[PDB]
């Protein structure tokens, strides 16, 4: 249905067995995402 993928596609062993990838144009890694000044009279804290 197409001929090329200029996309944020991730390389992996399985997809290479069936299609040909190029040299990576950016490197990355899995990571984890989580939910995230003293007052004027702060000397009383």
């Amino acid at each position: 249905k197409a001929d090329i993928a200029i996309a944020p596609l991730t390389i992996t062993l399985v997809r290479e067995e069936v299609i040909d990838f190029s040299k990576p144009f950016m490197s990355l890694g899995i990571s984890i995402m989580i939910k995230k000044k003293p007052g004027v009279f702060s000397f009383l804290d």
Partner: peptide, 29 residues
């Protein structure tokens, strides 16, 4: 010669333009 290019809307890699309603073809991306 022309290439069939596949993509997905995963910002900031691919995202539609503001008011892309007036854009047609490759310009809407």
């Amino acid at each position: 010669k022309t290439v069939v290019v596949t993509t997905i809307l995963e910002s900031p890699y691919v995202m539609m333009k503001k008011n892309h309603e007036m854009l047609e073809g490759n310009e809407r991306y």
